[PDB]
Design a protein around this ligand. Structure first.
Ligand SMILES: Nc1nc2c(ncn2[C@@H]2O[C@H](COP(=O)(O)OP(=O)(O)CP(=O)(O)O)[C@@H](O)[C@H]2O)c(=O)[nH]1
Ligand SMILES: Nc1nc2c(ncn2[C@@H]2O[C@H](COP(=O)(O)OP(=O)(O)CP(=O)(O)O)[C@@H](O)[C@H]2O)c(=O)[nH]1
Ligand SMILES: CN1CCC(C)([C@]23NC(=O)c4ccccc4[C@H]2c2ccccc2N3)CC1
Ligand SMILES: [Mg+2]
Ligand SMILES: [Mg+2]
Lengths: 167, 167
C-alpha cells in the first residue's frame, strides 16, 4: 500500500483544519480553535490505487514556526493554503514555499496552491493573481471551500498526484 | 510547559474517537469511521497548571494490533475504554491492560478505566462489575458519554493526574 505524507500549511485562520476535517469527516467546523499539531492516517482510493494518506494539520500561529523544519523534512507534498479574503495569507505563501525549498534543498517539491473560503463574497485576492503565482512556481492552483466541499477532494487528490507524478 | 502523552485504547466501536473529538472539538461524531492512527495536541489548564496534552487516538481494529508496541512504549498514560452496552468490549479491557503491563514491564502504569456510552439505555455491563475490575488494577473508573460530554473532561484530567502521581 502506497503511503503519501501530506502537510497542510498556511497562515493562521486560512482554514487548514476546516479543509482537513471536511476531507476526512464530511462536515464543516464553524468554530476557530487554533492548532498546535494534529495528524490523521486515512485510506482513500485515488485513480484506482488504495492510498494511505498521512495528513499533518500544522499551526498557522507564528509562535510555532520553529516546529516547521521537522515536518518540512518528512513531508512529501505540501498543501499551501491561503484564504481568498485575506491578502496577508496570500503574501505569506511565498515564505512557506521558500522555507520548504530550503529544507528539502530542491526547486521541485510536490505542492498545490489552495485559495480557500471561495464561498465568501468578501474576496481580496483575484483568481488571476493566484493563478499567475502558481504558474511562476510551476504548481497547480485550486480554489476551495471547506464549507461547501467545493474543490476539497480535488485539492488533496491533486497533491497526491503531484507526489506520484514527481515519483 | 509540562507535556503528557495520552493514549486512548479499547475495542473497535467503544467510542475512542468520539471521546477524543468531544474533548478537543466540543463536537459529537455520529458516524463510524474506523481509525488507523490519529494524533492531537491540546493546551489545557488542569488544577491551575498549563498542560500540553499529546493524545493518540488508536485503532480498535485487531488488524492494526502490531502498531500497539510503539505507542505502548512511548505512551505515558492510557485511557482504557469499553462501552457499557457492549459486553465483549468490557471483556477486551483485560487484554489491553495485560499488553500495556508487559510492554512497560510494570504493574504501576498510569491508566483510567472508562465506561463509555452511559447516555444509552441498553446497558449490558453493570457499573459494579466495572468498579471491581478498576479496583483489582488499582486505577480510577469513570463513566462517560461522548454524546452529552458527561465525564469526558473528568476522564482525561484524571489520567493526567495519574501521570503526575506516577512521576
Ligand atoms: N466561509 C468559510 N469559512 C471557513 C472556511 N474554512 C475555514 N473557515 C473558518 O475560518 C476560521 C478558521 O478556520 P480553521 O480551519 O480553524 O483555520 P486554521 O488555518 O486551521 C487556524 P490555525 O492556523 O490557528 O490552526 C473558522 O471560523 C472556520 O469556520 C471556508 O472555506 N469558508
Ligand atoms: N450514544 C453514544 N454513541 C457513541 C458514544 N461514543 C461513540 N459513539 C458512537 O459509536 C460509534 C463508534 O464510535 P467511534 O468513536 O468511531 O469508536 P472507535 O472506538 O473510535 C472505532 P475504531 O476502534 O474503529 O476507531 C459511532 O457511531 C459513534 O457515534 C457515546 O458516548 N454515546
Ligand atoms: C505523526 N505522528 C508523530 C508522533 C505522535 C504525535 C506521538 N508523539 C510522540 O512524541 C511520539 C514519539 C515517538 C513515537 C510515537 C509518538 C506518538 C505518541 C505516542 C503516545 C502518545 C501520543 C503520541 N503522539 C503521533 C503522530
Ligand atoms: Mg488549524
Ligand atoms: Mg476511532
Amino acid at each position: 500500500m502506497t503511503e503519501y505524507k501530506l502537510v497542510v500549511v498556511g497562515a493562521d485562520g486560512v482554514g487548514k483544519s476546516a479543509l482537513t476535517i471536511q476531507l476526512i469527516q464530511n462536515h464543516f467546523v464553524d468554530e476557530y480553535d487554533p492548532t498546535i499539531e494534529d495528524s490523521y492516517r486515512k485510506q482513500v482510493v485515488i485513480d484506482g490505487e488504495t492510498c494511505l494518506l498521512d495528513i499533518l494539520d500544522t499551526a498557522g500561529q507564528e509562535e510555532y514556526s520553529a516546529m516547521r523544519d521537522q515536518y518540512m523534512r518528512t513531508g512529501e507534498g505540501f498543501l499551501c493554503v491561503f484564504a481568498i479574503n485575506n491578502t496577508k495569507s496570500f503574501e505569506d505563501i511565498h515564505h512557506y514555499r521558500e522555507q520548504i525549498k530550503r529544507v528539502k534543498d530542491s526547486e521541485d517539491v510536490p505542492m498545490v496552491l489552495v485559495g480557500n473560503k471561495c464561498d465568501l463574497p468578501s474576496r481580496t485576492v483575484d483568481t488571476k493573481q493566484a493563478q499567475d503565482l502558481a504558474r511562476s512556481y510551476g504548481i497547480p492552483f485550486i480554489e476551495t471551500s471547506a464549507k461547501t466541499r467545493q474543490g476539497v477532494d480535488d485539492a488533496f487528490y491533486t497533491l497526491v498526484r503531484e507526489i506520484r507524478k514527481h515519483k
